């Protein structure tokens, strides 16, 4: 009864994930040869000319969200949706530094020019600056109120500027960690932010056609710097600005909208601007001969010019630019990476290695070497060991497909009522049959190598046989509703179909007659499978339950919770009564049909799973998901014991009196030290509370004492510290702050040590200073309150004098009395 573990071996069929950013990398001294692309939880580096993956960088259970290469080029920073930041060494391929300050998906990373500091932005409204060399986090900035879009350093005076999904741009002083300037120009999200022209111009992209620009000048009064609205340049795209980027030490400004076309802009600077101004002035002089402020204004608008815009096959997610001719690399929704060259032509594509859409159907060959995956408009064949695409065919669509017993041919179903045949060697379509009126949903292979069965949206179910390879229809069975799935018995005796109404009906193969009906699902059954013995059939529905039935009498053995959403596909292992299931809950589970028990959970994918396949030997399992990826699992020799695996899922100060003496002791030590420091001229606690006098530090300790615990803490306090505290109390009264608390403290010490204080002659000067200060300060505080007493009383009498004038007199008196009547609780 011992079970075995399935382990995820490799990931294939992915070129580039839709979320993320594409970046060039420098390997072996070739800047433009290699590119780094993000996939599901992993990041891949490709060689565009060869078309091969040089190396893969390992990930851990979380999708990668954004990329940033280090300025030196040895390292590239990786951010994930969890919030962990990991930096990978390109040559070694292993990253050993982990940064996990953030609590949400990481939006952007950026390096400074030297590479010593790293800035991270996340959807949570925080900015964290990390020390790259020391592998520590310096400080956190919390000003923004929405997700962070872009964060950029300033080289000249160590300033950071950030933009967010909220309609604000915030400037930060890194030395003091303070936000000194805020821009409120825009009305909508600030999606893009770039620095240009040696940190003298600012560019922002918003959800509007116009593109604004500012000029920055270095020094409600402005602080540190000032910015003015320089102007605006128009965009051809009428949609939001997805990306703004500027090539490193380059003159190309790139604007990208939601549409596929990518817009490029070229700046004019240094002598080029001056030469253009001189040419314009000469042209104006020539016009004057034929027959200024306007010319200068014309020069300002033409400071940046529009070069021809590059167009791509489909919409772009992320792009990167490099300048030596401009080389631009792109990423699309299709997992396709393209490069274009312009001073536009497409120089290469890496379309090979992945389908252009979601792979909906998945099949294995009769032998285990070959793996068939098909999607919309594509069919590909994979070698199981090598993991390379053998051959590709264009198809109308793919919903169902089986591998014919001949190793040479393949058969697929379409969402249109068509069926197609291909050879692996020929790579051509044999013929196209109008098999069904509607969409063909399911199709099954008979144990004897002759024939196959088709069912689809058209209410009939049709039988076909193989006849160069061709197929013909023998007989059809007509139903009341459409058929979601057909599953054919291991022997030629039974045939099973699933209908729109929540029932599975079994028909005799030979005579096409009713034999049983299986009901009890709230929602229609999507997937079915029958074991090799034929005793058991498992049905999974849109409702989360899966049910096991006996074929002999149609009795339900068990009903299982299974997934948290609709189950998508089901299939038994070949040897025994163990089946694999897949649902929209991002998970894969396997069950023992005999013991009705859940053995394992596979947790590779990150999106809902469309299809699954298991090898005829049963050793290998391949699955497909909404994320454009394909994963392979292999059975391992290590035994699996259930309750241990069940256990794995379960697993996955100082007293008041004591403070006073320490405060006094700290005061004594510092005064001796500062005495010595001045002598030379001719602690951490202090800066912890902010730089203050040592005398001041004791004052808050007195404030920190609770009111109730005040008297006994002073009573416990020894007489050795009494001479010092009396001196310190004298300073506190003279400042005039917190007089009452010190006076209450002072008078308590004098009474309790009245006998001892009199004897000591050293304390005579202290009491003389205390005597003068105490009465002098208390009187002044009382006099200020006393003066307010007289002033307020006079104003009270004037208001009452006015009231008598109005005194209809009875009504006014009643209103006055009603105003001055309060209500109290009383036990009568």
């Amino acid at each position: 009864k011992q079970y075995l573990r399935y382990v995820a071996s490799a990931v294939f069929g992915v070129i580039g994930s839709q979320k993320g950013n594409i970046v060039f990398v420098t390997l072996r001294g070739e800047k433009g040869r290699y590119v780094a692309v993000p996939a599901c939880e992993h990041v891949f580096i490709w060689d565009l000319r060869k078309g091969e993956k040089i190396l893969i960088l390992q990930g851990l259970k979380q999708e990668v969200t954004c990329l940033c290469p280090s300025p030196d080029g040895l390292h590239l920073a990786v951010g994930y949706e969890d919030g962990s930041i990991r930096i990978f060494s390109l040559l070694s391929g292993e990253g050993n530094v982990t940064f996990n300050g953030h609590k949400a998906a990481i939006t952007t990373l950026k390096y400074d020019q030297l590479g010593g500091r790293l800035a991270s932005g996340s959807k949570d409204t925080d900015i964290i600056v990390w020390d790259v060399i020391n592998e520590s986090g310096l400080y956190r900035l919390k000003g923004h109120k929405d997700a962070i879009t872009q964060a950029l350093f300033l080289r000249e005076k160590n300033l950071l500027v950030t933009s967010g999904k909220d309609t604000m741009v915030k400037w930060w002083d890194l030395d003091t960690q303070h936000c000194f300037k805020t821009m409120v120009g825009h009305r909508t999200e600030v999606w893009g932010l770039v620095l240009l022209s040696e940190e003298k111009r600012l560019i922002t992209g918003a959800s509007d056609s116009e593109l604004r620009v500012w000029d920055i000048a270095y020094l409600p009064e402005d602080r540190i710097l000032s910015c003015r609205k320089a102007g605006s340049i128009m965009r051809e795209g009428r949609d939001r600005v997805v990306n703004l980027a500027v090539d490193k030490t380059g003159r190309i400004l790139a604007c990208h909208g939601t549409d596929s076309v990518l817009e490029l802009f070229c700046i004019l600077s240094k002598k080029e601007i001056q030469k253009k101004m001189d040419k314009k002035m000469k042209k104006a002089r020539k016009k004057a001969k034929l027959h200024p402020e306007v010319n200068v204004e014309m020069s300002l608008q033409d400071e940046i010019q529009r070069v021809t815009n590059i167009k791509t096959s489909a919409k772009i997610k992320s792009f990167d630019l490099i300048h030596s001719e401009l080389k631009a690399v792109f990423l699309l929704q299709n997992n396709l990476v393209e490069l274009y060259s312009l001073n536009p032509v497409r120089t290469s594509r890496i379309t090979i290695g992945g389908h252009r859409s979601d792979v909906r159907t998945l099949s294995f060959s009769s032998d285990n070497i070959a793996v068939l995956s098909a999607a919309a408009d594509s069919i590909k064949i994979w070698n199981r060991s090598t993991l390379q695409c053998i051959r590709t065919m264009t198809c109308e669509y793919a919903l169902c497909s089986f591998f014919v017993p001949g190793d040479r041919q393949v058969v697929i179903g379409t969402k249109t009522g068509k069926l197609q045949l291909y050879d692996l060697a020929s790579g051509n379509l044999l013929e196209t049959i109008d098999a069904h009126d509607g969409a063909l949903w399911s199709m099954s292979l008979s144990p004897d190598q002759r024939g196959f069965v088709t069912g689809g949206a058209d209410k009939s179910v049709k039988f076909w046989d193989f006849e160069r390879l061709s197929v013909k229809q023998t007989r059809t069975l007509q139903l009341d509703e459409d058929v979601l799935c057909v599953s054919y018995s291991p022997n030629q005796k039974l045939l099973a179909v699933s209908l729109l109404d929540c029932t599975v009906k079994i028909f005799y193969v030979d005579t096409l007659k009713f034999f049983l009906s299986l009901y009890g699902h709230k929602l229609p059954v999507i997937c079915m499978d029958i074991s090799h013995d034929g005793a058991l059939i498992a049905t999974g529905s849109a409702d989360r339950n899966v049910k096991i039935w006996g074929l002999d009498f149609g009795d339900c053995h068990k009903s299982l919770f299974a997934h948290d959403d609709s189950v998508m596909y089901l299939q038994f292992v070949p040897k025994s009564h163990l089946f694999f299931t897949a649902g929209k809950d991002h998970k894969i589970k396997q069950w023992d049909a005999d013991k009705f028990e859940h053995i394992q959970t596979l947790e590779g994918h990150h999106q809902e799973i469309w299809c699954l396949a298991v090898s005829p030997s049963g050793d290998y399992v391949v699955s497909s998901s909404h994320d454009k990826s394909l994963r392979l699992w292999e059975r391992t020799r290590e035994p699996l014991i259930l309750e241990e695996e069940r256990e794995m899922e379960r697993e996955a100060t100082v007293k008041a009196a004591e403070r006073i003496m320490e405060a006094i002791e700290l005061y004594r030590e510092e005064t001796a030290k500062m005495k010595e420091h001045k002598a030379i001229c001719k602690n951490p606690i202090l800066m912890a509370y902010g730089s203050i006098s040592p005398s001041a530090y004791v004052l808050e300790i007195f404030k920190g004492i609770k009111s109730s615990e005040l008297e006994e803490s002073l009573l416990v306090l020894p007489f050795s510290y009494v001479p010092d505290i009396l001196k310190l109390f004298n300073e506190f009264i003279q400042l005039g702050s917190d007089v009452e608390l010190i006076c209450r403290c002072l008078f308590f010490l004098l009474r309790i040590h009245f006998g001892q204080i009199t004897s000591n002659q050293m304390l005579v000067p202290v009491i003389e200073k205390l005597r003068e200060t105490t009465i002098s300060k208390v009187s002044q505080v009382r006099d200020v309150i006393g003066f307010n007493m007289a002033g307020l009383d006079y104003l009270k009498r004037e208001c009452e004098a006015k009231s008598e004038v109005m005194f209809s007199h009875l009504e006014e008196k009643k209103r006055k009395r009603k105003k001055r009547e309060k209500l109290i609780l009383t036990l009568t």
Partner: peptide, 8 residues
Amino acid sequence: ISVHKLKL
């Protein structure tokens, strides 16, 4: 209800 919403 249609199978397109459920399976496709």
